[PDB]
């Protein structure tokens, strides 16, 4: 139901817009509105399906 | 309930239309409307059933 | 609730009609209408029960 | 909730009537109407309980 | 919710009446009406609790 | 929700009354009415909790 | 939701009253009324939590 | 939803009042009323969390 | 949904007030009212998360 | 749905306010009101996600 | 449904605003309102997906 | 107005149905409904007319 | 008000119809309907007036 | 109209449920409800018809 | 219709609660309410059926 | 229906309160109100069940 | 308005009925109903007027 | 109007029920409901009339 | 009408809940609600009846 | 009805909040609202029960 995004670099954008600096962690749940989440920049994502590394 | 698409190359299309560049990651939930998702180009998909690599 | 079809060859048909080219991946959920899905051609399917290879 | 039938030979019948050729794969969900599914001929079935081989 | 009966010999009866020949496989779900299923003859049954061999 | 009774000998009674011969298999679901099932004679029962052998 | 009692000796009482002879097996579901089950005598009980041996 | 109490000694009290003799087994479900169960004396309890031995 | 408290010493208090002597075991479910349970004295608690030893 | 806090030192505060002494254990469920719990001082917490040690 | 944040350094901010000092632990559930939680500073987070370390 | 039945052996039936084990004693009064009492097995009966020994 | 019939042989009839086997004992009260009781076969009767032996 | 039960051993049950310890004496009258009284364990009963010793 | 209890020792309890000292005698009639009388301690009871000695 | 109390010593109390001196005799009937009679001191009681000597 | 009764021996009666054992202390206030208090046995009473020793 | 009870030993009961451990002090006022207070165990009581020591 | 509690040690609890540190003094009046006050830990209490020292 | 607090040091808090400097004296009466008064810091209190020294 929720994802965990650790921003490994500054200015990481999360759309669905929010900006994160280096070292912050955003835990985001899916609402009715937020049905899709796009991640730019270098970040480390943990979902239910496992982990992944956006660049 | 949701899929994770890491676009390994530029111009990856996701239909159900959105375009992704290299290194971005789209986490997509299934709405009532979006009942099917088609992925073109080279991308790395994680679902509940496991991982797969579209080309 | 959903299946993952990676089309390993061109012109793979999915009925319930859609056509896929080589390398694309279709993630399909079951609606009320779509109660049966038929797959032609060479494709690689992941379901909840495991994987299978249609030819 | 659904079964996966890979038709290993031509003319495989699925009742509940549909016909499959060799190499096709039918993913069938149970509706209210379809409460029983009979499979003739040589086919390879995956259910939640495991796999089986009809002849 | 459903059982898988592979008829290992001809004339296998399934009550709740249907008849199966050798090599066929019947996947049967429980409705409101079908609250009990009786199997005669030599057959190989897979349920959620495991497998069994009726004779 | 359901039990599987393989009658290992003739005349096995199932109350909640039905009679089974040797080699038959009865798959019984619990209705609102059938809240208790008594098994006489030599039979082999599979439930969710495991297997047991009535005599 | 249900328990399995194999009566290992004659006259096993089950309260919530029923009597069992040696070798019988009673599969009992919990209704709204039957909220507690007491077992006397030598019997072998399988529940969801495991097995136990009343004496 | 339910607990299993094997009374290892005579006069075991179960409050929420009932008395058990040595060798009996009480399987108790939680109603709306019975929201707490106290066990005195030497008894052997199986719950969902595991086993324990009251004295 | 419920906790198991074995009182290893006399006068163990359970608030949410009840008192237990040495060797007793209280199995407590959470109602709407009882939303917090405090345990004093030496006791051995089993929850869903595991075991713990209050002093 | 609930957390287990063993207060390893005196005066441990739990906000959402309650105070605990050394050796006590508070098992706290989440109501509608209590949507966040803050723990001060040296305490040992067990949740569903595992254990942790507040200082 | 809930996350566990151990603040490893002083002044850790949790948005969705609260401030934590070193050694405190905040257990936060997701309401309807709190649909996203941002964590600044050095903290140690446990979720259902595992652990992570914000900086 | 009442009879006294000492069950000298196990499984003594009293109709008007109840079962008694060895050593138990049932004191039964005549209601409007219970106008006849039948005793099977080995038992020792005391009535107003004297004593008798059913076998 | 009541009689005690010990059936000393099989098939003893009691009219007012019931059948008794050897060793059974029937204690019969007089209703408004049952104003006369006829006993066939070998039986041993105790009434208020004493004992008698029907053949 | 009433019976006298001297409990010669501990835990004597009287159904119609009450428990007696060794040396206690229960004098029980027959109500409209209590139309049958069953005595377990070792006890010494005095009725109008005489005395008896349950075991 | 009534019983006579001579309390041979102090603190004799009569339930149905009253307390008697040594040497007192309680003559108790059965009301509609008092349908059962339990006697603890050492006492000497005279009923219509005879005498008895509770301990 | 009535008891006879000869007061063998002064100050004998009869509750259900009356006081008797030495040598007096009280013949007491049971009303609806007086359902229990307690006798203190040294007295000699005659009932229907026989005689007794309170002290 | 209130009295203090320390029961120096067992079975001390307080009427207005209650029983006390040795070492207990009853602090009794005067209601509208309790307008007189009688104390039997050996006890030590403190009132507003001073102390006294009942025997 | 109020009493002061210092519990000199563990498990001191105060009826009118509360339990106290060693070293605690309960200051109790008389309500309309609490018209009598009984103290068990070893405790030290101060009233308006002076002090006393329950055992 | 009021009591004076000087907390001689840290964490002194006053129920009727409040916590006091060493050296603080709480002057508490009795409301309608607060009809009983329990004091834990080492504290020095002055009432109208005198002084006392809880531990 | 009233207390006298001489603040022997600066910043003495009186809750029920007011602050006092060194040498000031606050005479406080109990209203309906102010039912409890807490004193921090070094102060010298005179009540009806005597004097005390908060620290
Ligand atoms: Au594009
Ligand atoms: Au065909
Ligand atoms: Au039986
Ligand atoms: Au206690
Ligand atoms: Au801050
Ligand atoms: Au008992
Ligand atoms: Au008198
Ligand atoms: Au007493
Ligand atoms: Au505290």
Running DSSP on this structure, what letter comes out for residue B49? T
Contacts by S33-38, CB closer than 8 A, 24 or more apart: S34/T35, S35/R28, S35/R29, S35/R31, S35/R34, S36/R18, S36/R26, S36/R27, S36/R28, S36/R29, S37/R26, S37/R27, S37/S3, S38/R20, S38/R24, S38/R25, S38/R26, S38/S13, S38/S14
Q: Would you call S6 helix, strand, or coil by DSSP?
A: strand
Q: Would you call M41 helix, strand, or coil by DSSP?
A: coil
Buried b (16+ CB within 10 A) or exposed e, S18-52: ebbeebbbbbbbbeeebbbbbbbbbbbbbbebeeb
DSSP output for E12-40? EEEE--EEE-TT-EEEEE--SS--EEEE-
- Judge whether Q10 is closer than 8 Å to chain O, CB to CB: yes
| Contact criterion met (CB below 8 Å) for O45 and O3 | yes
Distance set, CA A2 to CA A47, J31, J52, K14 (Å): 7, 21, 21, 17
φ, ψ of residue L34 to 5 degrees: the values are -75, 95
Question: Which residue(s) pair with S3 in the sheet?
Answer: S28
Please count the residues of chain N: 55
- Judge whether N24 is closer than 8 Å to chain H, CB to CB: no
| Contact criterion met (CB below 8 Å) for P20 and P26 | yes
The dihedral through the CA atoms of Q13, Q17, Q18, Q19 has a sign that is: positive
Residues of Q in contact with R45 (CB under 8 A): 4, 25, 27
Which ligand is nearest to the Cα of residue N22, counting in written order?
A: 6
| Contact criterion met (CB below 8 Å) for G5 and G38 | no
Instruction: Tell me the two tokens of residue M4.
Output: 């005690």
Rounded-to-integer distance, Cα A39 and Cα A46, Å = 12
| Contact criterion met (CB below 8 Å) for C16 and C36 | yes
Breaks (C-N over 2.5 A) in chain Q follow: 16
Rounded-to-integer distance, Cα F11 and Cα F21, Å = 5
Q: Does an H or E element contain I11, and which? A: none
| Contact criterion met (CB below 8 Å) for B45 and B37 | no
Rounded-to-integer distance, Cα O30 and Cα C42, Å = 92
H helices present in L1-55, as ranges: none
Q: What is the dihedral of CA N16, N21, N23, N28, to 10 degrees?
A: -10
Which residue has 């079935």 as its token pair?
D45
φ, ψ of residue F13 to 5 degrees: the values are -95, 140
Nearest to F25 among E30, E45, E50 (CB): E45
- Judge whether N18 is closer than 8 Å to chain H, CB to CB: no
Among J10, J3, J31, which Cα is nearest to K26's? J3
Q: Would you call D44 helix, strand, or coil by DSSP?
A: strand
Rounded-to-integer distance, Cα A25 and Cα K13, Å = 11
Distance set, CA S12 to CA D21, F34, J19, J24, R2 (Å): 83, 60, 11, 15, 22
Which ligand is nearest to the Cα of residue D11, counting in written order?
A: 2
Phi-psi region of G41 (alpha: psi -120 to 50; beta: other; left: phi over 0): left
Rounded-to-integer distance, Cα N54 and Cα N32, Å = 24
CA of G25 to the centre of ligand 2 (A): 48
Which residue has 């040498």 as its token pair?
T23
Residues of G in contact with L11 (CB under 8 A): 10-11, 19
CA of F46 to the centre of ligand 9 (A): 56
Nearest to Q26 among R30, R36, R53 (CB): R36
- Judge whether T3 is closer than 8 Å to chain S, CB to CB: yes
Instruction: Tell me the two tokens of residue R45.
Output: 């009581």
Helices (H) and strands (E) in chain K, counts: 0, 7
Running DSSP on this structure, what letter comes out for residue E48? T
Residues of H in contact with I18 (CB under 8 A): 36
Nearest to L27 among N36, N50, N55 (CB): N36
Distance set, CA E8 to CA E11, E45, E53, J17 (Å): 10, 10, 10, 69
| Contact criterion met (CB below 8 Å) for O38 and N20 | yes
Q: What is the dihedral of CA H19, H20, H21, H27, to 10 degrees?
A: 170
Instruction: Tell me the two tokens of residue A8.
Output: 């490994």
Among T34, T28, T23, T39, which Cα is nearest to T4's? T28
Which chains have 3 or more CB–CB distances shorter than 8 Å to chain R? Answer: I, Q, S
| Contact criterion met (CB below 8 Å) for O42 and O12 | yes
Among F2, F50, F27, which Cα is nearest to E45's? F27
DSSP output for A2-22? EEEEEE-STTEEEE--EEE-T
Question: Which residue(s) pair with G55 in the sheet?
Answer: none
Instruction: Tell me the two tokens of residue D9.
Output: 């030979």
Best of B8, B24, B25 to mutate (most A CBs within 10 Å, chain A): B25
Buried b (16+ CB within 10 A) or exposed e, K8-46: beeebebebeeebeebbbbbbbbeeebbbbbbbbbbbbb
Rounded-to-integer distance, Cα E52 and Cα E8, Å = 12
Which residues have a Cβ under 8 Å from the Cβ of D41 and sit 6 or more positions away? D7, D9, D11, D12, D13, D54, D55
Contact between chain O and chain E (3 or more Cβ pairs less than 8 Å apart): no
> How many Cα atoms within 13 Å fall on the side-chain side of residue O44?
13
φ, ψ of residue I45 to 5 degrees: the values are -110, 135
CA of S38 to the centre of ligand 9 (A): 14
Residues of O in contact with P38 (CB under 8 A): 20, 24-27
- Judge whether G38 is closer than 8 Å to chain F, CB to CB: no
Q: What is the dihedral of CA F30, F33, F38, F39, to 10 degrees?
A: -60
Which ligand is nearest to the Cα of residue O40, counting in written order?
A: 8
Which ligand is nearest to the Cα of residue I17, counting in written order?
A: 4
């Amino acid at each position: 139901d929720f994802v965990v995004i650790k921003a490994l670099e500054d200015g990481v954008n999360v759309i669905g817009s929010e900006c994160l600096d280096k070292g912050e962690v955003l835990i985001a749940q899916f609402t009715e509105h937020t049905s899709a989440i796009k991640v730019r920049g270098k970040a480390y994502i943990q979902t239910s399906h496992g982990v992944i590394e956006s660049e």
